[PDB]
Structure 1
Amino acid sequence: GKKIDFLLSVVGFAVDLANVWRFPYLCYKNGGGAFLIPYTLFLIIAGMPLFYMELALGQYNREGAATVWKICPFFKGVGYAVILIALYVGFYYNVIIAWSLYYLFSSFTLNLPWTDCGHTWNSPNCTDPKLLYSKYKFTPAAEFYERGVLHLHESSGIHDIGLPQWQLLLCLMVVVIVLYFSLWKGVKTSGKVVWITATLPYFVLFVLLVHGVTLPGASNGINAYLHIDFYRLKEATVWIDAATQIFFSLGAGFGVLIAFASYNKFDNNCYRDALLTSSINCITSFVSGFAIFSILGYMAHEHKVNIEDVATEGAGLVFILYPEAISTLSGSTFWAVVFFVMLLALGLDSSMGGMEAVITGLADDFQVLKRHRKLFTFGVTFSTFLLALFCITKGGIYVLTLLDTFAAGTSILFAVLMEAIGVSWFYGVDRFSNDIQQMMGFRPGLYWRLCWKFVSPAFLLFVVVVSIINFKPLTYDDYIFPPWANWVGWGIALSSMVLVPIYVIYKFLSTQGSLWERLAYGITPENEHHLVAQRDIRQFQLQHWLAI
């Protein structure tokens, strides 16, 4: 029972909405097979060491994202930046959950709305194969998603977003109420119904893959998925996408792993947890991509169109694909209900931890918030609800893609780079290894220390610089955003990227003493401050820097 429960818990925390929603369309947009090489390379090199480092930091220091930086007082800015990024992500994460809830509600019927067109929301240009370079957007499923759910046809761009959709408004209200009621009592919510939610996604994926393999056109989709277009590997768009997807999917760099590890037993094995989580993450992503490409190859065969134009490359790819596969299953209503219930539960569980990260990180900084978890939870949830209500307008898909591109991109890459730089170079990679040994009893291997100190920061810096210099103006299918939209996106990214120097300056000015005294007080652990007067600072000697 001990091992099975641990395996189930790890498996349940891996698969999450990132894996089943964001990876499909990021892989499709990048050609499929060509997206796996950068994905796996970054997975190993950055994700595994950073996941392990965040787990170890949280477990040892027993502090949230903001307060964990008592070891290096200058990086509370990094803590605040990751907290802000976590706050930003929820705005559109909850909107995706609302879409899932809407589809679940719409699935309750014997005639699924996305099977054949002719409804009130269908344009005259519909084309139903059964009844008779553009992304199409004229099939029954695409028409349904883009008109009867988003009502995107009523917006001409990001400058004409319009008023919130009342149906999506109600769905967002329900999602937010569920989140609050599941977050107000405390952080302990597991061990009750995780059994069903820890296995339903994998069963759904298994049946979907088994059915998709045996479809008229799945062979072409699989061939495209496995084919690697090496010309795509030299543009840096695939590399930026892979890095951002790896850090969003693993959960490293959002301040959530630190907060959750703060509650772990002091003897808990972070190495095993990181290894298993990364392995499951990779395997699930690969299988999901396989199934997605099989389904879209079937669609290409059925729609008499090239595989590169069957469905959109935006955030609605899964909501346009999975209904198509479901319609091909016997008793489609039951399968649709099961699939969308699975999606809703998965999203709710993921978003719960995502918001708990911010709640705990901010509470650990001010004790008043910790003493009033209910009111603080309500405030955070209400702010998220309003800023997401901004994203369920008629032109809300444009704002959603703006956020999905600029909220956790270069911002999280810079935050994780600064986390690694701070911890390793300033605190001491040898000190971190000593803490890990004191916790689990064994010291990290040479590979982990090398990744923490040299390999991971180098790759992260390269990715950040390339993303900053190689920037593509935003587009959504055939829509090209106005320049001020790109400026607003970069401002959103900078809002979190810039908290680091601001806090460094603030700490330098607030500190009292001489320049060397200021640096000593800024690069020394708070509980270790009293050695500064004695003037033995390990950060001022070459040995601290050359340690490995």
Structure 2
Amino acid sequence: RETWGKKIDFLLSVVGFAVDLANVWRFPYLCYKNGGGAFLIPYTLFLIIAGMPLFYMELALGQYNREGAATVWKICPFFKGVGYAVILIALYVGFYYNVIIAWSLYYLFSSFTLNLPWTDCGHTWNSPNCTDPKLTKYSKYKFTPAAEFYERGVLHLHESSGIHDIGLPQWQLLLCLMVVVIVLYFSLWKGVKTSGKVVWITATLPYFVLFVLLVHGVTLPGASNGINAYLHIDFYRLKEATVWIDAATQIFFSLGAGFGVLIAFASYNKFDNNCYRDALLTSSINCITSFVSGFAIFSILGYMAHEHKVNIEDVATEGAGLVFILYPEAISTLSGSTFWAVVFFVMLLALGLDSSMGGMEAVITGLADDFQVLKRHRKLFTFGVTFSTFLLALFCITKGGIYVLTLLDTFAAGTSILFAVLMEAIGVSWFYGVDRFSNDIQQMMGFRPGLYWRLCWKFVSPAFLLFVVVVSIINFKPLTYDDYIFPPWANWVGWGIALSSMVLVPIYVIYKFLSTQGSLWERLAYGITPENEHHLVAQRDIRQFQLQHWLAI
């Protein structure tokens, strides 16, 4: 297998992997939808007890097994079905993640203008309802130039009444997505890249942009209200279950657990990489980045509330287009809006593409370790993955493609990834054993995990994942894009898409049971024991059939 270069394996380079589109785009709107302040406590809790333990576990598993997202379960075939699952989950992300980058690309095409299109009204897409503060509603107040440009000048949402009538893909977004998938193909057709300019620029540009945004927000008039709202904890929202689900999903998106990216990345690392320090640094940097991003978001929200004289909770939307409304307007206030807008759009395109490459690599590395034919047909396989994503994403660039994008973001990567990571934790801590995992970590790095890590991997994280799965399944809420209630059939289609990845585990356990020849004992042994230890099936020496294995702790 290949190995990453010294540039990306540096101690000060992991921060480059810490940045992701979820922390720049998804975390802002998730926190705004959850109120702000009431979302940081569940986020930090799931990071310290669930996110970081699963992060370390996936890193160690990928470093040990030296396999992709699916084959990494060579120690227990009965859980191999979850691998493909997360792969499909990653594929689901490609159905919408690539759609967002192209959006920023269109903004790039709107960035080379003296007068920015999101500054004032009077353009073609601007409806008569467009309101310019320099020159109406307490529900969402979508009558701002930045919102009119995003909904009518980019997505053309005014030409669609709902998800039932999506329309036709806009030619602008069509060409943008074509350029995006072409770059994605030409940046991955030669396998992994030891060192690249793309991963190098994503380590300094995002932090600089966030610092500039913070310095601008702390000086904007009226941002004090947003700052105070961000530092206010609403316990009645903590009593609700949606906040915890959103925090878990955001943690899994930011850290990458549940997509196969971590295992694929660790499969090409060295046999002595200290994943403990890497996990600590990643968690800390991600928490700090999320905190400062939420602070800047609430500062911009307070500024817009002061400028438009609208309430903070009703000044902008709570969907996937929030960062395309708040961030641009602030750039309009800074001197030289053109240069800052260009820099911000280039940063978005960079982090967006770096995330798509990481996610697509997880799909390929896994499917090639499954089928060695695809290992040699990389350029043809890459094309298939990218081209399939481009097509199945043509749905999200239609006049009403934002609805399908939100549906995929809510259901395709909702309870499915939670169930996947729960099955992974169960298969690693119970079926495989915490003792064997600790011995592997010791023989790889030189030290055994403490009581805390093992108790989290075996008891804390699985229990919390089961809890969030239960509250996601039972306490379900209908999807609404802040104004439009999705019809019941849309929710049924979303649940079916989620089940498409969820039921991959029992389907595989059924297949692994029928394909295996022998009695029930032999079938169960071949399904729960590692391949290289299959000889122990002949000697009738199975650890999982002993009480000491499940009581290892």
Above 0.5 in TM-score?
Answer: yes
Quick one: distance in 2 between partners of 1:22 and 1:108? 26
* 8 Å CA contact 1:8, 1:195 repeated in 2: no
SS in 2 for 1:403: helix
Deviations 1:50-75 (A, max 9, x none): 00000000000101111111100101
Q: Contact 1:474/1:481 (CA < 8 Å) preserved in 2?
A: yes
How far apart in 2 are the matches of 1:328 and 1:530? 70
Q: Distance in 1 between matches of 2:8 and 2:152?
A: 45
C-alpha distance 3-264 of structure 1, shift in aligned 2 (>3 A):
closer
Supply the distance in 2 between the matched residues of 1:479 and 1:4 (Cα, whole angstroms): 44
Within 1, Cα distance between the matches of 2:343 and 2:196? 22
Please report how far the alpha carbon of residue 7 of structure 1 lies from its aligned counterpart in structure 2 after TM superposition: 3.3
For residues 490 and 198 of structure 2, what CA distance do their matches in structure 1 show? 43
- The whole-number CA distance in structure 2 between the counterparts of 1:442 and 1:197 is 32
SS at match of 1:67: coil
Give per-residue Cα distances to partners, 1:484-536, cap 9 Å, x unaligned: 00000000000000000000011011111111111111111000001111111
Return 5+ residue gaps in structure 1 as ranges.
Answer: none
Q: Which moved more, 1:192-201 or 1:25-34?
A: 192-201
CA distance in 2, matches of 1:71, 1:428: 10
Alpha-carbon shift at residue 194 of structure 1 (Å): 3.5
CA contact (8 A) 2:33 2:318 kept: yes
2:114 to 107, 110, 115: 110
Q: 1:394 to 1:192 in 2, by over 3 A?
A: closer
Query: How far 1:4 moved relative to its partner?
Result: 10
Q: CA deviation at 1:80?
A: 1.0
Deviation at 1:24, TM superposition (A): 0.3
In the alignment, which residue of structure 1 is the partner of 2:131? 127
The alpha carbon displacement at 1:193 in A equals 5.2
1:259 shift after superposition: 0.9
Q: Does 1:206 align with 2:234?
A: no
Q: Which residue of 2 aligns with 1:245?
A: 250
Q: Distance in 1 between matches of 2:474 and 2:300?
A: 36
Aligned counterparts of 2:38 and 2:496: Cα–Cα separation in 1: 31
Q: TM-score if structure 1 supplies the norm length?
A: 0.98
Q: In structure 2, how many angstroms separate the alpha carbons of the residues matched to 1:107 and 1:192?
A: 23
Q: Deviations over 1:102-152 (max 9, x none)?
A: 111101111000000010111111211101x32111111111111000000
Deviation (angstroms), 1:5:
6.7
1:294 aligns with 2:329: no
CA distance in 2, matches of 1:327, 1:144: 14
In the alignment, which residue of structure 2 is the partner of 1:6?
10
Q: How does 1:388-537 map to 2 (within 5 A)?
A: 388-537=393-542
Contact 1:34 1:233 in 2 (8 A): yes
Taking structure 1 as reference, are residues 543 and 399 closer, same or farther at Cα in structure 2, changes over 3 Å only?
A: same
Alpha carbons 1:218, 1:296 under 8 Å: kept? yes
Picking from 45, 50, 53, the partner of 2:49 is 45
Structure 2 distance, partners of 1:383, 1:96, is 17
Closer, same or farther: CA 192–334 of 1 in aligned 2, 3 Å: closer
What corresponds to 1:343 in structure 2? 348
Q: Secondary structure at the match of 1:391?
A: helix
In structure 2, do the counterparts of structure 1 residues 218 and 155 end up closer, same or farther at CA, with 3 Å as the change threshold?
same
Please give the root-mean-square deviation of Cα atoms over the aligned residues, in Å.
1.3
Residues in 1 aligned to 2:384 and 2:119: alpha-carbon distance in whole angstroms? 41
* 1:189 CA displacement: 4.6
* Cα-to-partner distance string for 1:290-334 (whole Å, 9 max, x where unaligned): 001000100001100111111000000000101111011001111
Contact kept, 8 Å, 2:199 with 2:354, in 1: the verdict is no
Q: What is the rounded CA distance, in whole Å, between the counterparts of 2:301 and 2:329 in structure 1?
A: 9
Matches of residues 71-220 of structure 1 in structure 2 within 5 Å? 71-131=75-135, 133-192=138-197, 194-220=199-225
Structure 2: distance between partners of 1:351 and 1:189: 17
Per-residue CA deviation, residues 247-296 of structure 1 (Å, 9 max, x unaligned), is 11110111111111011101111111111111111110000000010001
Return closer, same or farther for 1:245/1:4 CA change in 2, 3 Å cut-off. Answer: closer
> Shift of residue 190 of structure 1?
2.3
Whole-angstrom distance in 1 between the partners of 2:198 and 2:173:
27
Shift of 1:195: 3.3
Q: CA deviation at 1:235?
A: 1.2
Alignment partner of 1:54 out of 54, 58, 63: 58
3-state DSSP class of the match of 1:314?
coil
80-89 or 193-202, which deviates more: 193-202
Seen in structure 2, the aligned counterparts of structure 1 residues 100 and 522 have a Cα distance that, compared at 3 Å, is same
Contact kept in structure 2, 1:129 and 1:303, CA below 8 Å: yes
Looking at structure 2, the residues matched to 330 and 14 of structure 1 have their Cα atoms a distance apart, in angstroms, of 30
Structure 2: distance between partners of 1:304 and 1:191: 46
Could you tell me how far 1:174 is from its partner in structure 2? 0.3
* Aligned mates of 1:139, 1:365 — CA distance in 2: 50
Distance across 2 between alignment mates of 1:361 and 1:400: 25
How much does 1:197 deviate? 2.5
Distance 1:60 1:517 in 2: 27
Provide Cα deviations, 1:237-256, integer angstroms capped at 9, x if missing partner: 11111111111111011111
Assess, with a 3 A threshold, how the Cα gap between structure 1 residues 80 and 61 changes in structure 2: closer, same or farther: same
Offset, 1:187:
0.9
Identity of aligned residues (%): 100
Return the alpha-carbon distance in structure 1 between the equivalents of residues 244 and 414 of structure 2: 12
Find the aligned partners of 2:392 and 2:196 in 1 and give their Cα distance.
32
Distance in 1, matches of 2:495 and 2:89, equals 14
Give me the whole-angstrom Cα distance separating, in 2, the residues matched to 1:97 and 1:303: 29
Moved more, 492-501 or 2-11: 2-11
CA distance, structure 1, for counterparts of residue 270 and residue 150 of structure 2: 45
Task: Work out whether residues 198 and 354 of structure 2, in 8 Å CA contact, stay in contact via their aligned partners in 1.
Answer: no
Shift of 1:196: 2.7
Q: 2: CA distance between counterparts of 1:459 and 1:502?
A: 25
TM-score, with structure 2 as normaliser: 0.97
1:378-420 deviation per Cα after TM superposition (whole angstroms, max 9, x unaligned): 0011000001111100000110100010111100000000000
- Residue 27 of structure 1 and its aligned partner are, at CA, apart by 0.3
Secondary structure of 1:45's aligned partner: helix
Distance (whole Å) between structure 2 residues aligned to residue 14 and residue 514 of structure 1: 48
Rounded Cα–Cα distance in structure 2 between residues aligned with 1:518 and 1:294: 59
Looking at structure 2, the residues matched to 169 and 294 of structure 1 have their Cα atoms a distance apart, in angstroms, of 34
- CA shift, 1:159, in A, is 0.5
Q: 1:4 to 1:361 in 2, by over 3 A?
A: closer
What is the CA deviation profile of residues 424-455 of structure 1, one whole-angstrom value per residue up to 9, with x for unaligned ones?
A: 10111000000110100110111000000000
Q: Give the deviation of 1:208 after TM superposition.
A: 0.8
In 1, the alpha carbon distance for the partners of 2:496 and 2:200 equals 42
Please report how far the alpha carbon of residue 458 of structure 1 lies from its aligned counterpart in structure 2 after TM superposition.
0.2
- Cα distance in 2 for partners of 1:102, 1:193 equals 20
SS in 2 for 1:364: helix
Runs of 4+ in 1 over 4 A off after TM superposition: 1-5
Q: Given that residues 7 and 195 in structure 2 are in contact (C-alpha distance below 8 angstroms), is that contact kept between their aligned partners in structure 1?
A: no
Preserved contact between residue 19 and residue 202 of structure 2 (Cα < 8 Å)? no
Whether the 8 Å contact between 1:8 and 1:198 is mirrored in structure 2 is no
Point out the more displaced range, 18-27 or 133-142.
133-142
Moved more, 207-216 or 193-202: 193-202
The more displaced of 1-10 and 446-455 is 1-10
Following superposition, the deviation at residue 6 of structure 1 comes to: 1.9
Deviation at 1:3, TM superposition (A): 10
Deviation by residue 1:64-112 (Cα, 9 ceiling, x = unmatched): 1111111001011011111110111111000000111111110111100
CA distance in structure 1 between the partners assigned to 2:70 and 2:125 by the alignment: 48
